[PDB]
């Protein structure tokens, strides 16, 4: 088992070090039930990022995997390249009718930069479908993440991710992120910050020209950087300007939709209607690859004119198995009530994660819904960060091994400042948290001894 | 008839010009100049109160450097500095070299600005390749800065209405805030504290790009478009740490502000700053004969001097011998007539006269450095309430514009950023100009008031 290669010698891992499996075992998961994943040596732990922010639902779900076996049995796949299935039909009318304002038209894709470059695609066309060609850049945040394919790639903000590959498509351009906790402006006051951080798009466009930028892409909640929350009415700020200067808003929900902020689609937890939703991951828990670009009836009437035709599309985007499987996963939402399960606990898991705010090594917990991250320092008072060397040795070295070997699948990061970041399934509760919160604040213990000084 | 005539309208396709305006009207035309003077096509004076387009420092007429011209083109007027030198382009690229600051030691002649902005991004990003950091190439520059047209120096360019029908241009050039202390968002009262702000927007953009991906910072010592913004105390020192720490090159583009305009030759050496490398063009040879230049420091050359390798960039014309010639004639003027400490001398009474126009209303601002000022136009001072849209085309262009050549002075209204009225007048200007200028201002801004408000 320890000495077995299969893994290194064949499966390129993604984002990973295939070094580190040279001379020892991949860790490997066979089997979820729950909350909960099993290793091949019949280890358990905690799920703590529900798979990679996805499932939603829980692992094991008979009625999902029925729903699989049931759609490919009678029609596994047809293209909806000129002609329709009808569960993609269904789904179609289903995400529109959950979707805000006149988002009420759905092009589906298999996973969320597929999504992303749907949505760049689109808004370029369309602003030379409604004569006004020049229309073609796009704004996102400092550390966001936003998929792989090179377009997508453009408008993600993480330059590690992106120097190899350079050049890549023109027109991204970055502004600051919402991380209140590190603000150089206005860290006392969210409003004020807010507003601050809404008008740094607005000052993009003005700097590039309102008549060459196309779209705003933003995450409801931003993940890479460890899960800042929009700041009071930063999000009406945005939609203000995107609509003085006719630029498109892109709320990128691949990780907010589906629950993990306690509504379908995460726009409506902070009370902004965007052109355009991204999504993918939950919404079949994972269970089947599907995503959408969900647009404006607005951005589609050009289209639906005459001889026009969006002229984008993917072999599997709207699969029938993968649609019957969103069918029945937004059933188990809605029998089971677990938007509002979310809505209901996100105060107590919040809660229950601030009491590690009693250990010198946490510096913020912050977050919404059932998404948190939880920044570690080295000195809380002066918000004192690790060393690179100690966030090799201590954040990567010891914490990330630790917090799996003591039961707790989560994220360990330092893509911005050195953070913990927890998404588990939506079915998780009060025990679910106090599980968490108690492996944590044994591994954080630990871990405080192992910084020097402090 | 003279006012009939269109052969300019027919065949002269001018710089940045509405050429419609002049189907039926004639086309302004000068044909004579004297010290700060021109004269048009009818024998009417202007004062030159951008000499020319921020280039005439020595003055019209200049009989010295007229001299010089043929004196070279009858002996050599052109052979290529191609794997060949001409004794002229080496005395100036000496001299320019030992009037440059730090190890600036080394000059790649060009004939002008855009042409030496390219020379400058082309350069940053070969020397990269060759040390072994290949994915550094972007270029980081200011909002509302004009750095030229060929397409590259146009990705630097910071105008978006210059860029939009030229798009895409070369990729990697990002913007931050310019230095407009008279609208900053924020430390609008504290210039210590906004030079730190504005400076640390380009360690922001450096980190959101990711450092090893960026080559270059362009800035002018002085912005010239959005009207004369000069440098914030501790802005250019702050500036030149950052590059330092992220292995960035500092680029002085001083097309304008070379040459005497600030009262130095090199304007950096005005700020206190070495940068890695120097574009100037325009004043080298007061305008009497094209050329400018790249100043490189010896740092950045290494590289490039070591073994086979080459700078694989060239112009025909660079180095030309008469523009050469000229170009050490003028610094010649320059240096008997100690035109750079003039500068200095009166920089503070041409301000200061200036600044008496603050007891108009439509005047909002008066800023700058050395002989370059702008005024800014405003509907209240109070507020800092700018013009409309509306305002600005009756007002500015329809009447400031007119008015101001008509009362005899020639100088740039201008609405790139906000509405300005921009002065740089040969460098022989002395207080009987400064008095002159004041004086049209002052006539014409009054008249531009009641305008104003004619609505
Ligand atoms: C906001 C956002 N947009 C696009 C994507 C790309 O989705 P696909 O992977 O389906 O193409 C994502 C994906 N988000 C994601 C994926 C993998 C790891 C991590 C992490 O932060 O550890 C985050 C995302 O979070
Ligand atoms: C800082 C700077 N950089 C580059 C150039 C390009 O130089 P050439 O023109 O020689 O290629 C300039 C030129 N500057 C310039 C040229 C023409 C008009 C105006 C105006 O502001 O009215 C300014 C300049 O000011
Ligand atoms: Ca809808
Ligand atoms: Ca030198
Ligand atoms: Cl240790």
Redesign the pocket.
């Known amino acids: 088992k320890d000495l077995s290669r299969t893994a290194y010698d064949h499966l390129w891992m993604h ?1 990973t070090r295939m070094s580190s499996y040279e001379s020892a075992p991949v860790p490997t998961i066979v089997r979820g039930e729950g909350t909960y994943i099993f290793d091949d040596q019949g280890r358990r732990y905690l799920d703590g990022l529900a798979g ?2 996805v499932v939603q639902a829980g692992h094991g779900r008979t009625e999902l995997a029925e729903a699989a076996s049931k759609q490919a049995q009678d029609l596994a796949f047809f293209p909806i390249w000129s002609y329709a299935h009808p569960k993609a039909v269904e789904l179609a009318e289903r995400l529109a009718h959950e979707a805000p304002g006149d988002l009420n038209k759905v092009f589906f894709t298999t ?6 470059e749907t949505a760049w695609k689109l808004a370029k066309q369309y602003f030379k479908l409604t004569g006004k060609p020049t229309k073609h850049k796009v704004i996102s945040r400092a550390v ?5 394919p090179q377009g ?1 790639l453009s408008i993600t903000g993480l330059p590690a991710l992106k120097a190899p590959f350079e050049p890549l498509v023109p027109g991204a351009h970055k502004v600051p992120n919402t991380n209140i906790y590190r603000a150089p402006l206005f860290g006392d006051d969210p409003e004020a910050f807010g507003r601050w951080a809404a008008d740094q798009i607005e000052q993009q466009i003005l700097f590039e020209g309102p008549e060459t930028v196309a779209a705003v892409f933003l ?1 409801p909640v931003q ?2 950087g460890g899960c800042f929350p929009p700041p009071p009415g930063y999000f009406q700020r945005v939609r203000e300007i995107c609509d003085q200067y006719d630029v498109l808003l892109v709320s ?1 929900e ?2 907010c939709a589906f629950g993990r902020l306690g509504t379908t689609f995460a726009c409506d937890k902070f009370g902004y209607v965007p052109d355009m939703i ?1 999504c ?2 939950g919404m079949t828990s994972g269970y089947s690859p599907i ?1 959408a670009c969900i647009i404006s009836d607005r951005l589609a009437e050009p289209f639906y004119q005459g001889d026009n035709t969006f002229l984008h599309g993917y072999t599997f985007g709207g699969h029938p198995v993968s649609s019957a499987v969103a069918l029945a996963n937004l059933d188990i939402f809605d029998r089971e009530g677990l938007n509002q399960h979310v809505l209901d606990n996100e105060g107590t898991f919040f809660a229950t994660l601030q009491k590690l705010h009693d250990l010198p090594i946490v510096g913020d917990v912050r977050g919404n819904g059932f998404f948190y991250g939880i920044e570690l320092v080295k000195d809380k008072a002066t918000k004192e960060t690790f060393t690179e060397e100690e966030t090799e040795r201590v954040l990567y070295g010891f914490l990330s091994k630790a917090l799996f070997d003591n039961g707790l699948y989560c ?1 360990a ?1 330092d893509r911005g400042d050195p953070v913990i970041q927890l998404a588990p399934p939506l079915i998780s509760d009060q025990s679910t948290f106090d599980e968490i919160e108690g492996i944590l604040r044994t591994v954080l213990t630990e871990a405080w001894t192992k910084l020097h000084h402090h």
């Not at 996973?111 to 992303?116: F, L, M, N, R, T």
């Open positions: 984002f990679l922010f996973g969320g930069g597929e999504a992303v966001a993440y936003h998929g792989t997508a995450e993940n890479a990128d691949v990780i991204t993918a991951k995503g994220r990061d």
